[PDB]
Write an enzyme that holds these catalytic residues in place. Structure first.
Site: not given
Ligand SMILES: [Zn+2]
Ligand SMILES: [Zn+2]
Ligand SMILES: [Zn+2]
Ligand SMILES: [Zn+2]
Ligand SMILES: [Zn+2]
Ligand SMILES: [Zn+2]
Ligand SMILES: [Zn+2]
Ligand SMILES: [Zn+2]
Ligand SMILES: [Zn+2]
Ligand SMILES: [Zn+2]
Lengths: 196, 196, 196, 196, 196, 196, 196, 196, 196, 196
Positions: J87-90, J128, J156, J158
């Site tokens: 996950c490139e967010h966290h 995704q 996910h 997260c």
């Protein structure tokens, strides 16, 4: 006649049911006197009276609390409602599950009562075909919905035991009305949804 | 006091049963004149005779074709033998399976026979505890083996419906004999095998 | 005090429970007047009174019919008996199954009553530990058996919801007595048998 | 009439709740002096505040970190989102899952956010029909997408315990919008996918 | 007489079989001129030969490559070996599976071969009691290990059809040799690895 | 020739079959003198007479009690009806299930008999295909319904044993009559409720 | 240094972590300027602070309300307690379940907290092994019980992703204290009720 | 000769295999010139040097990170480790799963590393009975534990296809050491603990 | 060149393969002289001529018994047919299942025969996409049906092991003809009907 | 900048990663001198590189062997391809599976390669929504078929961890191209084959 018989009348037929059941014990070639059988004529009698109470109940005093939610109009479903009825052909049980779906119109009945309508009609001497159609109808008349659908899958001991011991021998009997009846796309959504 | 009620002994009460049932229906609040209850007292009369059709049978004759194998003495097990019986208290069906295992001495009972045994004792007004023991006995007796161990699991309709509608309430009843009774490493082996 | 409060007293506390429940609705920041909430103070009140009826029941009038089968003396088990109780710490439910096993001595209680003892003690403000120990004991005292074993696995909403939503968080609490207590080979047979 | 009751608005009634509960217990037939019920009126007071802790929240702020993806327009689905709510009629928990799917236009809501939405509406005295619709709305609104479709399945404790102890009675409630409402080959695709 | 009967005798026994089956067809009240049974004598003849080809094989010619790894002295298992056999009593298929567990001594039998020892013994008119013991021994001979343990589970079709439909009734038999016979920790540990 | 062949024709052909088999045992290279095959021919013969008794039963004969319900016009289905049968090509059992469905017109057939029709045809040298179309018809013609739907799945022992070993090899065969055939909707909805 | 590091230390180290990550994004060859990783460092940083908050909690602190029950001396177990955690070797999540069991002495711990002890330690850079022995102890010492039994199973993301792909690779780790360790019986019976 | 053979050798190996296949592609009955086979002797060439790479790898460069945790001395289990090997007898695959259990002493190997070890021996021309002993072995030397417990299970493709076409045919092989070997109460608790 | 190559040719083939393996056994890094490998070049020699026997077989001698049943014209399905092939790209197995569906016209092939056909093409150096078309094809020519429907599913061992080690990785391939191809309502009913 | 960054840059980015992770360790309040985290900077550094190696690969170098079978024009499917992503967010793992369904035109991609196109796109910081679409296209490009259909299901971490434990919440996304986009009978028929 009509009117539903309550505890008073049931309180009097006990001795005649008791006796009807005593006479039976002897006829099966049994000795009504064993410690076991001893109080059976009363128990059995007492019991039979239970699998048939839906008689002393009326869909009106049972109704009420049909909340006027209205604002929704989208397929409500209460699946897996347990049901235990009495084959009216050979006084043997047939037990199963009942599923119900409807398109509320202005009113939406509480969930606690849908499982109730099922009981008013299942605790009687029935045939599966009819128990089904009766539930569906009561629901309609009381809720005045766009469409009602009832499917009842149950196993019968009459089968599973006497005649030929065929376990599984599950019979399903449905009754669609309105939108469910007319429109197959909807009826399709119903069925392909009471599975999971 | 002996005498396995026979055909004429059956045919003599059928009409008597029919009556006691024709009663019950009336004593129930129903109307024996509908189309379904027209022929019930017979259908029932007859049904009930079926579920108690094990009274007229004898283990003696039921026996035989019991091969003198002997040279095995290594635990034989016939499991998942389906059973169907009658509660002798409320007269409501109770159904399940019976499992059985032993240690052949000089005799090894025909396979099918093991299920026949199970059938003579279940087709009677019973009580699970007893029904379990009788089977186990009849085998000890008719086979004079090193050890017997019978285990019955069946779900009761008396519970499952009336009283407190509790399904899943499977009551298991064991009964060990000989090596099974004494040798627990034999008993412990049995149970872990009547599974997979 | 002692003595179990029946419908009379319960018929009077309704208004005070009703009110206790009305006061609450307002305190949660709700408008008691919505069509929904409208009759809730009575329903809720009326309901709470149900999850706590085991109070007005006594294990004596509930007992009776403890058939003197005796002739057996081998591990009876009634598994999967459904149970729905009330966490006495935060008035929230915890629901599960109960399993019971015993070594009858001279007496053997009907199966229909074991599911009953479970209800006399579960419909109260409980802790799991105690509900368990109470069932086991009632069974002992009433049946005077060689050994009793009770295991209770249930899920608590107090967990599953508030605090931290941990589904599964199933807690099992057992209570063995006599043979079950003393002898581990027996207790072993019990557990490795309530599974399947 | 607006205003998401806050911390002080909570802390102000906690003691009020505590009281109404201290009442209930007495009005129940219990004795608030035992060790368990000593601290309950608070534990409860506090518990209940938790399950209605969604009142003090706003979708507005709860929103955000809603990426302007756009260039997808291909159905996104977040399923098995666990839910826990309160029946507004008897105030008895009802639990299940909520499934949700849509067709991103120019906006695609952060994943986690979808569950946050589900959480603001369930932590309230609710009714499944409404709770289903609100979620679905909040998404239509906060995402102005091509189509939304929310489906909730949860088991009720109101039924499952009191009335007619029917477990398995999972009542499913759908609510489609836009393409889902109109395009049924899209709707028919959704349902067959919120499964495997 | 011993000595295997091959395709020279398996071609010299056919027309006899064709004739007999052709006779059976008629004694059964069918017309052997029907399209279906036109060549049925030949087919059932040829089939019968197939089901009984195990006779025409010698364990010794089945063996060979019995590798001398010797070094292991640790339990090996070959589970779920499919087994189809012929009840020599009525000549009706009884089918199942086999599980093999030996304790290597000086040679490990080539795995694929533990499956052959099976088809040699199952492809004949048999009794489960014997099919079993035979497979054990055979191994014991061809390997000279420390212990061999064979358990077979089969569902005899004579029961599942004739007698009156009793499915499930699986029959399980076991022949323990060496360690397995003596060292129980081994036998049991065996029976707990043949389940998962 | 036709005319239902009763226990009479059979009581004479038995000793023929018995002799025919005697032939086969020796032709198989076995010994009809062992304790096993000593009586096998009479068991085998006798057994073959059982698996082919549907011959001695007339559909019409078994009907009688096709309760005149009419009042339904809503699909009644009876799934998982067990069925055992013979392969007319090699005379090897082939077994599985039969699920029937129909749309009652004026008459509805007692569910007990819906399962007997299956045994009058399964008990013969059959071919799934045929076996299927037969029940279908025998039902159209017995209830004069708006439609019949019959489907059978079964594992043929021929494949799963001889020939190859290809197990699982279940074969399904449909045969819709009336509406099930015409209206492709009713046919599909049948097909779904028979999975559930 | 010790002393529980509260939201204060963190409120300052965050911008460090945030910067540290910024470093990593570029070192990974990515662009910290894309809309994605534009704020990632603060999410990632912030996220890392969450997965390691057990640091800021003291066991003792969370206890408080270890109801003095004593009265039980019968194993209480709490299975399927979920747990998520970090690998101190590569800093990759590792997740699974925790099942605890103990033998209350004079004190019994409220079930809600039995699950909090797990989160104070799972929320840290851990090693299953350690994570395990910690809950065990923190519990011995909080309830002063006759015995503790703690077991954890979890899938490490390190294996199931990097390194190989070896999924399923669940790892279990026990740690019995007191009786569970001493008496090998209580330990085994624990191990069985945690499967069920 | 020993000493690992790396790429420099596998490279010089790719064309003597490539030809070894362009020969077995031809001497097969196929025309190695097509589009599909055009490159099979090299595709398959590198695939073989693949399934046999475990050779050129030594657990001296593979171990490492043999962390000195110690203070656990409680069983550690790493189950369902995916393993795939070659039948050195027929060069046919045979895939499965490896479960490893050990008792730490003064050292606990990192889990990631336990899998890497199964690979070093799993990727060679092997014998199931063998592949085990080695994997268990490496561990007693590389960790000096209290006793290892490896158990492997895999379905060999040599019987599944050629031979008799038997699926399911799982072959479990075990090897116990240290405590596992000698102390059963442990060995046991081990096995039953890896079935979850 | 065409024309089938039988034993006379496979025999002259066994030593050019045997060597082709004694070369790839060596050019592998192994010492083809051991006890296990002593015979691998011949064991494996005959195993290859095995997985490629489908070549020397023509469906002209395989068909036969193309029974002229006809009067069915209702879909016939033969599912879960076990199939095992070779990747012509890497000479690596890839096992699975073949389901076949067709509409009889004037002929219905015997089921036993449907499996034999999947084998003729399944035992060759193949391509999944391909192995299908042929199996479906042979059928439109050998039965002139209304349309075939073959669907295959198998897990290729080329990815499961070498490449990335991915299990589960099922690859479904289909090929529809006649009605199946053109009429979807059929094609569909087909697929949904082979999932049971 | 484009152009892949390899082990020459993957060795020139490590010490930076080691440093940053080393910094993280401290900003997290741990001691980087602890046995556990002694080399953790290096490990998490090396790990991170691994999880993001997808960048350093070109679809074009991933391809090659894209066989020209052309002849099929029938749906192929590659289901349950294991997928592990970041996950490139966290920068927290989100994991799942992929299902691929194309309609061959002139070339069928070598199956094992449909799995590679995955690892190139999943082994990177992702979303995704995109992981999906990318895989579709890629295929579309490298094959030029009639339609490609990609559906991915991932959970996910997260969510399942941060935010407050929401397991199950699987997310499903789909990118239909060509036929699948247009011809729905195809899309749906696709989505009914990716379930069994
Ligand atoms: Zn009936
Ligand atoms: Zn009863
Ligand atoms: Zn609580
Ligand atoms: Zn409610
Ligand atoms: Zn037999
Ligand atoms: Zn056949
Ligand atoms: Zn790690
Ligand atoms: Zn092999
Ligand atoms: Zn391949
Ligand atoms: Zn994320």
């Amino acid at each position: 006649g009509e009117r539903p018989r309550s505890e008073e009348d049931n309180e009097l037929n006990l001795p005649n049911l008791a006796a009807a059941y005593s006479s039976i014990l002897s006829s099966l070639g049994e000795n009504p006197q064993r410690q076991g059988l001893l109080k059976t004529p009363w128990r059995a009698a007492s019991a039979m009276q239970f699998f048939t109470k839906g008689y002393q109940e009326t869909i009106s005093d049972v109704l009420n609390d049909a909340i006027f939610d209205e604002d929704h109009d989208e397929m409500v479903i209460v699946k897996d409602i347990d049901m235990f009825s009495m084959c009216e052909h050979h006084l043997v049980p047939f037990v199963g599950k009942v599923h119900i779906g409807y398109l509320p119109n202005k009113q939406v009945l509480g969930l606690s009562k849908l499982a109730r309508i099922v009981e008013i009609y299942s605790r009687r001497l029935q045939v599966q075909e009819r128990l089904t159609k009766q539930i569906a109808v009561a629901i309609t008349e009381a809720l005045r919905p766009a469409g009602v659908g009832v499917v009842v899958e149950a196993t019968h001991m009459c089968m599973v035991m006497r005649g030929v011991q065929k376990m599984n021998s599950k019979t399903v009997t449905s009754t669609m009305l309105g939108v469910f009846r007319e429109d197959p796309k909807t009826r399709e959504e119903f069925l392909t949804l009471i599975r999971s």
